[PDB]
Amino acid sequence: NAAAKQLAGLVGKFDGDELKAALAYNQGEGRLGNPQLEAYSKGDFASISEEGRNYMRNLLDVAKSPMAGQLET
C-alpha cells in the first residue's frame, strides 16, 4: 500500500503520464535521476540510461503517456 501510494503520487505529481512515474520510481526522484525525469520531458531521448530507457520500455502497456507512443520510435 505504501508503494502504491508513492506510485499514485508519481502519477499525480507529474501528469496523466504513467511512464514518467515508472521512470521516476526506478531511477530515483531527485538524485542522479532528477535530470532524467526532466530529460524525459523533452522526448524519450538518450539523456536516459541503460536501466532507465529499457525499464521504461518494458511498461509499454497501460498507459497512456505521449512518450509511450513516442518511446518507440
Partner 1 sequence: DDSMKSMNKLDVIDKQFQKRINGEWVSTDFKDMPVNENTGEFKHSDMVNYANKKLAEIDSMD
Measured between alpha carbons, how far is 5 from 8 in angstroms, rounded to an integer? 5
Burial class of residue 27, CB neighbours in 10 A (0-12, 13-18, 19+): buried
User: Does position 1 bind partner 1 by CB under 8 A?
Assistant: no
The CB-of-2 to partner 1 minimum distance in angstroms stands at: 37
Q: How many residues bind partner 1 (CB under 8 A)?
A: 4
Task: Kindly indicate which of the ranges 2-10, 20-28, 40-48, 56-64 contains the residues binding partner 1, using the contact rule CB under 8 A.
Answer: 40-48
All cell numbers assigned to 45: 531521448
Residues at the interface with partner 1 (CB under 8 A): 42-43, 45, 73
